[PDB]
RNA sequence: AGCAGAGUGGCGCAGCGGAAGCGUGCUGGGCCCAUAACCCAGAGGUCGAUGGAUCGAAACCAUCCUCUGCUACCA
RNA sequence: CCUUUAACGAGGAUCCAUUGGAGGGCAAGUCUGGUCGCAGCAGCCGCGGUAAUUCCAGCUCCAAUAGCGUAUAUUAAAGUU
RNA sequence: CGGGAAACCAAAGUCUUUGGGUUCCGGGGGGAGUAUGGUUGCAAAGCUGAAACUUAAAGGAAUUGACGGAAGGGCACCACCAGGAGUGGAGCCUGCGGCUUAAUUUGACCAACACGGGAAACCUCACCCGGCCCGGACACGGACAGGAUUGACAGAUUGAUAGCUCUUUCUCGAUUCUGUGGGUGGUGGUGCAUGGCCGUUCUUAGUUGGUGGAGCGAUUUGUCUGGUUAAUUCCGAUAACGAACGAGACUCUGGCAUGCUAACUAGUUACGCGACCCCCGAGCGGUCGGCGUCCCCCAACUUCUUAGAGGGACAAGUGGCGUUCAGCCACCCGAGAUUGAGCAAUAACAGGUCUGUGAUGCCCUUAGAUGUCGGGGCUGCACGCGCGCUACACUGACUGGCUCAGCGUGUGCCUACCCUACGCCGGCAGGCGCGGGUAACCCGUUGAACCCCAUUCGUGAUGGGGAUCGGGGAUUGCAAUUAUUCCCCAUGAACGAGGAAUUCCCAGUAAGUGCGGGUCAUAAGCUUGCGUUGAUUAAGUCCCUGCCCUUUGUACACACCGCCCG
RNA sequence: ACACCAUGG
């Protein structure tokens, strides 16, 4: 139960990288969508959320733990 | 030494102690000898012997003995006295030696 | 240089051939609420060195060395 | 100078009362911060060693008041000449 | 009489109601009867005799305690005597000091030291070394729905599969985030700020007020000369009377009931029996008998077991000793003439506990935490000490055989585990398989050990003793290295009864001996209870260590561990 | 008919 010493490195913790909200489509036409990024073909998942363009990787952030295909 | 002193603040005594270093207008001594009346010779370990007296504080609850470190503070208009604010154990005293505080000439 | 005395436990010593202890000091216990006094146990020996006698010695004999007192005091 | 008199001359913020004290003797706070047997206080007894009614200050209160405190001489208290 | 602060005083009285005459002499405590001057003396010395300085008390009488190497009366195996077993010596276990260390967390010094249920592998856990987290309410303000904010795959990184951080960019959705106040948690500090609890003074007989009496008062009597008692228990005496607490009474427990109540979750006896077995008896072997925890009874009963109600012992009877009182000794009868514990006063201690607590004041820290995971420690070893276990053998060790207990516990809610029968397998620890028990129902008729009866050893550190160490096999667990515990072969240390000292104990007690509960995933050399075998010595005293009551002394009151002189 | 028995954070 003593005092605490000057440290050396520390540092809390990341700050959320702050990249734009959604641009996820673009159209060929007005009602004439494209996808960039294929959506998940996942049961849990609703078939709305999107992959991680990750090349070498492809990432769902829903199923944190697996479901990665890996080219 | 025993007695049937129960009574009192019964035990101030750990394995844990923590340094403290001189300031303004405070030395380093050395008790030369033994004098009566609460007083005592001392001896700053730089120059004058400056007779010192023990302070309320100490009387009766930490005990100097002759030729042992202590941390007197110096008085601004006289010279000659000075009043016995701590002492050091021998550990301390050497440990001090080691921060080379105190000018080797008087051992442990 | 000589006479006399002594050489044994850190120190003072005892020890008239069948052979290592005493007093003090040192360290740890006991006693006491505690300290001294007092009680106990422990540690520490080329018995000055070298030969000889003796069935066998620290002791007796011979040589040498080292301390102490007293005179000698000595190109 | 006083007195007699014109003309000016007050709203309380200034035309602003101080000197000592608040444990007891001895009238008046266990209010709040700071120091921690130090600094200091205290005529006397006594306060201060980390939760100070006595120190340093703020607020409040007590005493006498254009006065109040201190050192000394002396009188009463002293039926202690 | 009266006086006085009182002790005391017919004088120390006739004193604020103060005046019979007269001589000497004092003015807070020291410095000091000192320095100096004078005078006396042979000398030693006598007489007269200051001051500077210093200090808040010195002192008197009486009271209440504590103390006494003071006296009187009593008392206790935490006292002795007479003894027993010992402890101190040896090896090991465990606690405390010291040393060492990153850390070896810490409290406590008769009334600490096998104590904190403290037998710590993780946890516990407070210590040391690293790493995540917020589980920072609430208020205000700030940013914010192209949006506050959450979580995470892969490579690097890390003890780590902690999105911890870094590269990359999906996902969540107002729950957050930033800042200022303010809370919160803490096995952080202070037990000398406290509550509560406990320990101890203190196991003895001690304590207190109301009205009355004595004193100016603190105080005192009641609460006692004497006898008696384990006892301030009684008898009595009596300026006290009438009361309260503690003691006693009280509760649990051990000893006795052939009397009562009544029992297949306890038994006995009887025979209904039936059956096995042996002649072991007359006899044939059958009938009669003998053994049975072999099987039955809608047999009869409660002796043994259980547990309820009552009974029973009161110094009641008899003899002595007692002021013929309170009571004491002995004896008959008897299950017994003195079982053992629980509870316990006023006043107090700077006793222990903030580390039992959602008991608690103040101080400290509060996101780079003193609020969680991984690793190490609490166990380290020149040494000093405490409580203990096993031994030093023949009143023994070993190997077989035989035969007897009692107190208990037992399936768990969060928490995941209990006690075991019997069959098989294995030398052993242990494994597999099937049942009973929430219990007078099953383990269990609890086949306990010492003891008893026979073998081998033979005075030799021996076949006594079992430390230390090598190699192997099991079980618990997430994990056994610094060996958790258990089993097997081997190695085979000190120790031949213990110096000065010192502890505990009076009858089913000391000591020997094993068994349960507590802690317990694993596990007792500890402690808390139970039985089993079962002595020697006492019926006393105040010597030693202390305690209680009276008288006495005191320069003590922080109370003899006091005070105090040079 | 009487050995020794000092001191106190
Ligand atoms: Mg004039
Ligand atoms: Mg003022
Ligand atoms: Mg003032
Ligand atoms: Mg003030
Ligand atoms: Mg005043
Ligand atoms: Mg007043
Ligand atoms: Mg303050
Ligand atoms: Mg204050
Ligand atoms: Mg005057
Ligand atoms: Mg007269
Ligand atoms: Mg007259
Ligand atoms: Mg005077
Ligand atoms: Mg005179
Ligand atoms: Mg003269
Ligand atoms: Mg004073
Ligand atoms: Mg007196
Ligand atoms: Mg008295
Ligand atoms: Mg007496
Ligand atoms: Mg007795
Ligand atoms: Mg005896
Ligand atoms: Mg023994
Ligand atoms: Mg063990
Ligand atoms: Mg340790
Ligand atoms: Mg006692
Ligand atoms: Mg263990
Ligand atoms: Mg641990
Ligand atoms: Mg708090
Ligand atoms: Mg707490
Ligand atoms: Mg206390
Ligand atoms: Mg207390
Ligand atoms: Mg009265
Ligand atoms: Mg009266
Ligand atoms: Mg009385
Ligand atoms: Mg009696
Ligand atoms: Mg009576
Ligand atoms: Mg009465
Ligand atoms: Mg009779
Ligand atoms: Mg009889
Ligand atoms: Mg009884
Ligand atoms: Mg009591
Ligand atoms: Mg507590
Ligand atoms: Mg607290
Ligand atoms: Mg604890
Ligand atoms: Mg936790
Ligand atoms: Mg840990
Ligand atoms: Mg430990
Ligand atoms: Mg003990
Ligand atoms: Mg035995
Ligand atoms: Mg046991
Ligand atoms: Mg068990
Ligand atoms: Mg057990
Ligand atoms: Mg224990
Ligand atoms: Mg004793
Ligand atoms: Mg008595
Ligand atoms: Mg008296
Ligand atoms: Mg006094
Ligand atoms: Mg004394
Ligand atoms: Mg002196
Ligand atoms: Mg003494
Ligand atoms: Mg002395
Ligand atoms: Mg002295
Ligand atoms: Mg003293």
């Given at each position: 139960?003593?005092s605490?010493?000057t440290?050396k490195k520390?540092?809390?913790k990341?700050?959320?990288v702050?990249?734009?909200?959604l641009?996820?489509?673009?159209?060929?036409?007005?009602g004439?969508?494209?996808?960039?990024?294929?959506?998940?073909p996942?049961?849990?998942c609703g078939?709305?959320?999107?992959?991680?363009?990750?090349?070498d990787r492809?990432?769902?952030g829903?199923?944190?733990?697996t479901?990665?295909?890996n080219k | 030494?025993?007695?049937n002193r129960?009574?009192?603040?019964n035990?101030?005594?750990s394995?844990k102690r923590?340094?403290?270093?001189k300031?303004d207008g405070?030395?380093?001594?050395?008790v030369?000898?033994?004098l009566?009346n609460?007083r005592?010779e001392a001896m700053?370990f730089?120059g004058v012997?400056?007779?010192?007296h023990?302070?309320?504080?100490?009387?009766?609850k930490?005990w100097?003995?002759?030729?042992?470190i202590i941390?007197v503070?110096?008085?601004?208009?006289?010279?000659?006295?000075?009043?016995v604010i701590?002492?050091?154990?021998?550990?301390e005293?050497?440990?001090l030696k080691?921060y080379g505080?105190?000018?080797?000439?008087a051992?442990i």
């Amino acid at each position: 139960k003593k005092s605490y010493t000057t440290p050396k490195k520390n540092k809390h913790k990341r700050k959320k990288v702050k990249l734009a909200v959604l641009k996820y489509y673009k159209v060929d036409e007005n009602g004439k969508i494209s996808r960039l990024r294929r959506e998940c073909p996942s049961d849990e998942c609703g078939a709305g959320v999107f992959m991680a363009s990750h090349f070498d990787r492809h990432y769902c952030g829903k199923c944190c733990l697996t479901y990665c295909f890996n080219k | 030494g025993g007695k049937n002193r129960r009574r009192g603040k019964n035990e101030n005594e750990s394995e844990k102690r923590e340094l403290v270093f001189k300031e303004d207008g405070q030395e380093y001594a050395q008790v030369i000898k033994m004098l009566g009346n609460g007083r005592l010779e001392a001896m700053c370990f730089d120059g004058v012997k400056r007779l010192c007296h023990i302070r309320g504080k100490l009387r009766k609850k930490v005990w100097i003995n002759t030729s042992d470190i202590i941390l007197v503070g110096l008085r601004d208009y006289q010279d000659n006295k000075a009043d016995v604010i701590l002492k050091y154990n021998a550990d301390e005293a050497r440990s001090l030696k080691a921060y080379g505080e105190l000018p080797e000439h008087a051992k442990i």
